[PDB]
Amino acid sequence: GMQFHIDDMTCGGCASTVKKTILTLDANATVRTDPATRLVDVETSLSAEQIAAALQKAGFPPRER
Numbered sequence: 748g749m750q751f752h753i754d755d756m757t758c759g760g761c762a763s764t765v766k767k768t769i770l771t772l773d774a775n776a777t778v779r780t781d782p783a784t785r786l787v788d789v790e791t792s793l794s795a796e797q798i799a800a801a802l803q804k805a806g807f808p809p810r811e812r
């Protein structure tokens with residue numbers, strides 16, 4: 748259970764693209780996004796660095812929280 752803040756997750760369709768990116772990397776992951784807090788909560792067997800790397804490549808660099 749890992750959490751990221753994504754400051755760029757504000758535009759139309761951005762939270763969808765975040766979730767879709769993570770589910771494409773790990774189809775068994777659980778992903779919650781909150782537009783009020785720009786927080787993304789992830790349950791996955793991948794590492795936090797693997798998730799962050801994927802988010803970065805997608806244009807949504809996170810900060811782990």
Ligand SMILES: [Au+]
Binds near residue numbers: 776777778779
């Ligand atoms: Au999910």
